Ligand binder design. Structure first.
Ligand SMILES: [Cl-]
Ligand SMILES: [Cl-]
Lengths: 29, 29, 29, 29, 29, 29
């Protein structure tokens, strides 16, 4: 029960990291 | 371009909040 | 003990989501 | 406008860090 | 200036994702 | 095992808070 929840959390933070990379790329461009 | 990225980020943090509420409920139970 | 801490964490991430929505709205405007 | 929003975000993440330290201390104890 | 900061942020969230995966693995085990 | 992981997480969120303060300062300037 707890394991999957923390896995869903790790996945959400990876999507967040992706979004901030995107943002970084939009600024440079 | 930037607006939607930050919106996608706000959505990810809301899913994260949901997950930690879930976790909180799993502990109590 | 642990439950409330994770609840305080879920609340903080919801405030964070709100802030990024705000930011998104400030960019568009 | 944007500056204060990111400041409110930095403050929220510091409260989050505090909460996870708390959690870490509750586990050890 | 801003680009690198958001890149440093994306990197921090990836380390966070790693940590929660670790945690998930510690629970199962 | 779990304690140190959550400590590493609290440290990552403090670095994140620092980065958003930086960003806030870059906007004002
Ligand atoms: Cl736990
Ligand atoms: Cl910006």
């Amino acid at each position: 029960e707890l394991a999957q929840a923390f896995k869903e959390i790790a996945k959400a933070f990876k999507e967040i990291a992706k979004a901030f990379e995107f943002i970084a790329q939009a600024i440079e461009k």
